[PDB]
Amino acid sequence: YPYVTGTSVIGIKYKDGILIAADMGGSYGSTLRYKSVERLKGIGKHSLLGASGEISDFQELLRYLDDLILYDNMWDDGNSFGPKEVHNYLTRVMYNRRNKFNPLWNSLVLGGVKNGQKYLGTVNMIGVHYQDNHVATGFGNHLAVPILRDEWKEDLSFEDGVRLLEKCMRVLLYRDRSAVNKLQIAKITEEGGVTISPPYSLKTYWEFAAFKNPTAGAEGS
Amino acid sequence: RYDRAITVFSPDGHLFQVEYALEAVRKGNAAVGVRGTDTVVLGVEKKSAAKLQDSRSVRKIVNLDNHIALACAGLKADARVLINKARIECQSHKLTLEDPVTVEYITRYIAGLQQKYTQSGG
Amino acid sequence: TTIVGLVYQDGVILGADTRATEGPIVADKNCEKIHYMAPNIYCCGAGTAADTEAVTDMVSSQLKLHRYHTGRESRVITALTLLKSHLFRYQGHVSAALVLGGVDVSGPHLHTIYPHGSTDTLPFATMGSGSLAAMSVFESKYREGLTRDEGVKIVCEAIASGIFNDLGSGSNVDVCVITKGNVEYLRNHVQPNPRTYTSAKGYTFSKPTEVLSTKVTALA
Amino acid sequence: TTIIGVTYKDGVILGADSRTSTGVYVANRASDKITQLTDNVYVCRSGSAADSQIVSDYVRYFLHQHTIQLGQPATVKVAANLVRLLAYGNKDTLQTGMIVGGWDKYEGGKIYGIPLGGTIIEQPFSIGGSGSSYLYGFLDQAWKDGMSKDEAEELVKKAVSLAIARDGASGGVVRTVIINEEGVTRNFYPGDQLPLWHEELEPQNSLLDIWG
Amino acid sequence: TTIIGVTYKDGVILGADSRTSTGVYVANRASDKITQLTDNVYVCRSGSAADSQIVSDYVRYFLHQHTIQLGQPATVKVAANLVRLLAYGNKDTLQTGMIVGGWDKYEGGKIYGIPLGGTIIEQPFSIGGSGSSYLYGFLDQAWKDGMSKDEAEELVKKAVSLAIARDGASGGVVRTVIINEEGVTRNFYPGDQLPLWHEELEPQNSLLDIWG
Amino acid sequence: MECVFGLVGNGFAIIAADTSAVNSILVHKTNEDKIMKLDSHKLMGASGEAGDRVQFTEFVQKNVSLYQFRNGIPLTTAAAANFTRGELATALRKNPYSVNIILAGFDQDTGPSLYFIDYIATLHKVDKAAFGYGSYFALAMMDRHYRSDMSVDEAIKLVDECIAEIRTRLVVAPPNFVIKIVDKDGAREFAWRQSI
Amino acid sequence: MECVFGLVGNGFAIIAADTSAVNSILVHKTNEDKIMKLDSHKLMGASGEAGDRVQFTEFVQKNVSLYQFRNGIPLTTAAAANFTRGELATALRKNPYSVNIILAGFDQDTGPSLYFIDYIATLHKVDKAAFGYGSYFALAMMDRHYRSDMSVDEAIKLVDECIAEIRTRLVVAPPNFVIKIVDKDGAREFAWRQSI
Amino acid sequence: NWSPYDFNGGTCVAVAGADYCVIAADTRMSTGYNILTRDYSKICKLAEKSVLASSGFQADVRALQKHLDARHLIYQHQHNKQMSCPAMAQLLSNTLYYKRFFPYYAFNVLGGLDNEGKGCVFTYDAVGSYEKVGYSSQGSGAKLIMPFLDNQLKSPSPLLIPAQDAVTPLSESEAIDLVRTAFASATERDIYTGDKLEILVLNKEGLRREYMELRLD
Amino acid sequence: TTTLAFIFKHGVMVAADSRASMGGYISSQSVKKIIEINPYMLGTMAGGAADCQFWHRNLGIKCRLHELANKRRISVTGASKLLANILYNYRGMGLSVGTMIAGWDETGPGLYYVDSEGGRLKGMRFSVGSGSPYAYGVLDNGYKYDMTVEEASELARRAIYHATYRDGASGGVVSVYHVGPDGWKKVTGDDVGDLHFQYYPVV
Amino acid sequence: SIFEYNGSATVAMVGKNCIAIGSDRRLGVQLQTIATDFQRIFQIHDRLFIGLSGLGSDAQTLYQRLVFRHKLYQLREERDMKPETFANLVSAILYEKRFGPYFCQPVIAGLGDDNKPFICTMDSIGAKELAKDFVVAGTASESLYGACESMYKPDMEPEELFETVSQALQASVDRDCLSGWGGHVYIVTPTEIKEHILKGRMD
């Protein structure tokens, strides 16, 4: 069963690089046990992934990928895994562990840029995978892919990318009940490398007259 | 598990272990079989009836099945192992295919087992 | 299905797509999902159809009888309370769920009603399968005091989002504008996805279709 | 959900959280979980939405009838007992937990907690809803009897915000309702007005305002 | 069960209750839930009493091998990761929460929560067991960074007694361990020494003392 | 369903068993001989699943014939029955066979001997037995007119009566039965009882 | 379990049925006649739970007789079938009877008719009918040899063939069948097919 | 508790002919009622004259496609020859069956030219049975496509002993058009099909890819 | 499905339908339900199609290896027993194979019915599938040992057609095979849609 | 389930000023084919026909009950009931048993007013599906939807409409094992009613 689980991890391929956002919450049933669980990591030189779902399993996937990437690096023969190979390895491991009826309970968003070809893709807890311009997991797949599809552009700027991604993440924060206001945006680019935003919280709006007074009256509401 | 090439080629290409097996055969009780128009008479030379030997319990000519009878020459102890394997496989052939074995099938099976023993290790 | 409700400055706007399905197959490409209850009240039905039409029709009749009895124009709170009193007593077995809107002596009203009788009063509402796809648009673009044209634009955007992003609902967009006096209903306001193919030469029925008997009646 | 009721010298300050969820989705962000029974008595609805709503309606109906019959402001005790009349009468069907608060010339400001199953417990304060559990420890060391309308208001805000910050089922704006001799005063505190507890940051429009 | 660990300016102060229950019978009322793993590291045992102690035994064994082979006292990080090894590799067999705390000359006093499933979360303070729900709010409201020994110990006492007071599964004494550069120290606080919270009366040898 | 029953008479033993071969509701074959000559002087009538029956009885016949070849002297009936029980018991907790066995055989010295073995291996030298739903009628009849020295013709008359009662009073009365006898001269088939 | 089937000749409608009454494995009776006479010109074979079969058939006969005496003109076959279907369908949702019914009859102005009424209360005027496991064999054989103008000799030959097959191929093959014919003269018993 | 499978939708179609074969399938993946991606290609070219189109569970479909590429590469290496279409068909039947007790949730349709050059189509089921046909369809929209394909492309079954002739084969362009109309009328009435049509036409001059824009809802 | 076979004077006939139905839907009606294991032997598909096909390929391979090893063509009894054992090793696995093995040994014809759970019968007439009841209903009436080949084939066709008519899951072309001393030959395949109106003329 | 206990296929389709309603023709316990001449289409009055797919018994009950109500309407009002009104009546009397529903999936088709076609099918509890191109019900639902979607045209003379509904029904029923054994198609025009019985596959 999933015990300590996280939530949506949206993804948006923008000009000159890739952006991924994910709140810092790990919930335990209904409680938010944890509110500072960095759920985005940088993998190798050319990659970056976030995970949703069980946080123990995600921490294990990090060990798998760290051994993979260290073994890859120690060769020093001048070729390394780009986003594509890393994502394919992730799909293979997730599917294999599904075949054992012992799944890794996570949903993985992995993306990155290598040789000027920027890749972004996803993997499910049962091996379902696809590579796209913008991906999401969990409720980010209901409440964020509509707005991502609606507003994504071929050459989205970095600031426009951040503002779109925050639009999505705020829309989730309004209506997910599993999401904490803390969150991180991760930037990966060619020749800059991965760069993870410091944690922060988004301003939210509640002062609508209909909210203040459901119905309307001097006494009732 | 003890694996070693007991049977190996000598410089001249001979299998000295198989040649020595033949030597052992050539010292065993002589046997003869003759095939007739409607009968197949086997025979063998036992070692002295006057000598205090009770032969009631073991027959030098044996049945691998109600339709197959076998005579050996050489190591008497090994003959028993062949006979048991052949009997078991004869009934097994009855049990997987309804037919009983032909003579040639069981001959081929016995020979194949005997050869396998000449190439496996240990 | 995707149904929607928005309260703009002058009144309440309702919206809904027009696909009706029975499992993975669309039974009816153009369904009428916004219903009339009273001259100032309409409701978009989601959930079990039979139940939604049954309950909305029963409340419509009750509301008309009350309109005669009192003479004065029916108000939305009456429809809401009658729907509550009916839905609850059947303990959610009648699985009708509606977005209800109107304009009254007290001004625009917008409620969501769920099969157990739980109701809400909201500035923007969405229901049906594409409720999340619509609420994306509402939580991104809604604001107070939208004018009629902006409000209708937002509702059409929400329904288009709930058409293109959810399989349960599709086809064409319909809208009902409920201002103080007049209710501007649009049978098929937005048809965003036409038929992609022409079929060129119509295909021929080679087998002559043998028939055994033909009774014929000279209908008057 | 969260619902808290606090008694101070003059009367009551019933509270709520505003989040009706249907699973993991937040069907409503500004639900009003405090309803009127009479001009001086309110109930904090919690649990099943339909059941609590209709029990509120029926109590308001019976209590209209009663207050006309007597021609006199109905008391809190009677409101609570009417809520129990239906909460206990329908143990099978109504999965509701409520807190009733009000004010009377007869007894002052009283809080009656009608937990799930239909008991009445007069209390100095009550806590309810799934977000209650995050508060027992805090309240036990916080409650001081005989506060003003102010300190009680701050305590109710703290309680509901602490439950909000940590509970999945509770969030949104904090609503409070101050009931007193002069009458009910309803308030509204968005998240922005509530304090910032352990490991929470100050809300900011866009990361573009900090960079990363 | 209630288990808590809090970091202070020079170490950690892990603390737990003492009640093992087989239904509605307190089988042991002075249980010791803070099991040593090394001179540095103690771990507060939660969940099933078999899994928690068997994991504790295995990580004691591993720390004994590792410290000797290395020749240096085992860090806290190593101990937390050894506990996680067991609790995660046996994700499907073990039902035990844990809290690893200690002091080590490298990273100073630290605390690693290891809830069900084996997620090492480094924290300033952690809480587990059934009696954590009642402390979530109190500790969001009360946590401070860098307290001294006395302040941290008193917070641990307040938190655990607040859990004891409202939690059926938590009760008895409050045990605390103060791991610090100069060494471990184990304290024991009967229910008598603990404060009194809402709705608690001074104990009394008999009623003939009051009534008569 | 497969009905088989046995009997021990003067110097012989008699096993009778229906010869229908039925799928769920369909009679694929009404000529299925379910009593095998386990040996020149033994019979093994079985009743269970068709696959289990055939495979297990063939396995026991394999072992019996192997013993006969290996030692020269065939297994005595008691030894054959005990071997069958042992094998069925060892298979009981690993991969159960669902066959019930009635083993009859004539042992030159002891005399006739019927033995009863059940799905859970329970052996008992018995002078009358029966498996299937027809066991009720078989056992009642036999207990009624059976004699420890009851000869061939009269024992077979009794078996005809048992067959007729089974065929007239069971809902699933099987039409055809086979009567097999075993005495000094070896196991044999005694006349088939056609009904259709 | 019961088997029933019908057949419409040029001026007659035969109905046959097995006559075995059972409990679990015992044929308490093999003379149980199940084809009822509703009128001088009606037959009603029924199959289903014996208690329900008897109670429903008696109820329907009561209503047929009540109609006859009160008006002076007997219910026509189609009306009797429709009334049966109505009563069975109304009971379906309230206290269902588990009876399957085949109704035959002759009316001077219409000729022989045979109605199919299922326990679900589906009514159809069938040329040939059958209920129970014997239904497969009966229907296949009738289809193979049925004509629309069969002399009672041919119809009875066909019913005999169907009975023989049902006995040969079913496992629950009942031994005794009754054959009843309806013609201009009236509902009647044609012959009893003793097997035992 | 988790489910080890998911209906990811889509639909596939194949129409063999005199010297060609039209494997065409849609481009859509759905988990319940939301679209995952609108660019999931279902056609996989396994050999120079074979094309596997699969619908169902995407993970299983892709695992199967990768496994068949591996087996075909091993075949090439061992025998120094590219594995003919019927050989591929039986290999895919075997590979589906070997997982008999934990089946792939993939409903497959091969296509392509047999070694002499006549187009083929092999229709499978999740357990592994298969049969050469002249046309086929599998996926969410198969039951809607097949009635129409049957009525326009129908001929005596090859089991009639005095063989009774067959309709003149629709030439390639007629086949493309028939597939297009089939998918248009299937995406009109089925919810799991649409967002694009991927037509793959395999012929003596090599395979060509074409597309047709189906509606987006 | 509905399939049948029966030995008579001039050999063994085998007749089968051509209808694969899953749930309530007709997957196809070109499915060949009579598998030729050997130029002198036919195996009939019934029950699970995947199971029957796979295990009949296995049986054909075992028979071919047997022909190679023994320099003599395996008999019908041998093949039937091989299949029965092979299936028995998977008794609890939920296989759905049940198939007639029909062939002409060196010792006259043979017909065995093998089953998914090791049930093997040597018989003189068989019929298997959901339409077996009607197949027997018709087959047993017209069957006579000495009926010549033409009327034997006609009897097999009529039986399969009647199973087809009264059965939901049986239909399509009616394939009929003849196994004799010189191996087997297909005699007829007649679409039931036309066979019906051959049998009951409209007029 | 219970809807495919008998199995049926019914279609309705709209021509220029004519309406056509088709149906299958077989009764079955489940797969037994008791009768190849079942009636699922009932004429209630000239220019109004109802097809009642689903359970056969529920169908007969609803038909007889509907005749009762319709005749009593003719005696009380003196006008034959208009199509849409009849659809509303059927919806009401189906929904009355909301919790005891009839397992029927009625199809309603009939000309009326200024000779204007009307077609609609309903859920088992009366949810109407007023359509304008065509309507399909029964076990062959999906196949009928595909066949009609691929074979329909907007405005069709009576003869084109007959040929199209016939081909759609037959091609869609051949892909269903619980339906077939002929067909029964009506072409209703404001001056003529033609009732056709089609030659089908009897398998």
Author numbering:
A (entry chain g): 19 to 239
B (entry chain E): 3 to 124
C (entry chain p): 40 to 259
D (entry chain o), E (entry chain a): 14 to 225
F (entry chain d), G (entry chain r): 1 to 196
H (entry chain f): 7 to 223
I (entry chain e): 56 to 258
J (entry chain q): 2 to 204
Paper text:
We determined the first plant 26S proteasome structure from Spinacia oleracea by single-particle electron cryogenic microscopy at an overall resolution of 3.3 Å. We found an almost identical overall architecture of the spinach proteasome compared with the known structures from mammals and yeast. By contrast, we found a significant difference in the functionally relevant β1 subunit. Unlike previously solved proteasome structures, the C terminus of the β1 subunit has a 20 amino acid long tail that forms a new contact to the surface of β7. In higher plants, we even found a highly conserved tail, which may indicate a motif for an additional binding partner or act as a signal for modification. A small yet significant subset of particles (7%) showed a 20S particle compressed by 12 Å that has less density on the non-RP-occupied gate. This flexibility of the free α-ring is reflected even in our high-resolution structure, where this α-ring is less resolved than the other parts of the structure. Although we could resolve the 20S CP well, the resolution was limited in the 19S region. We found a total of 30 pores in spinach, 25 in human, and 12 in yeast, ranging in diameter from 4 to 17 Å. We suspect that this new conformation of the 20S core protease, in correlation with a partial opening of the unoccupied gate, may contribute to peptide release after proteolysis.
Arguably, the most important component of the UPS is the 26S proteasome, which makes the final decision on protein fate and catalyzes protein degradation. It is a 1.7 MDa protein complex that acts as a multicatalytic ATP-dependent protease. The 20S core particle (CP) is given the proteolytic function and consists of four stacked heptameric rings. The two inner rings are made up of seven different β subunits (termed PBA–PBG) (Fu et al., 1999) with three different protease active sites (PBA/β1, PBB/β2, PBE/β5) hidden within the inner chamber.
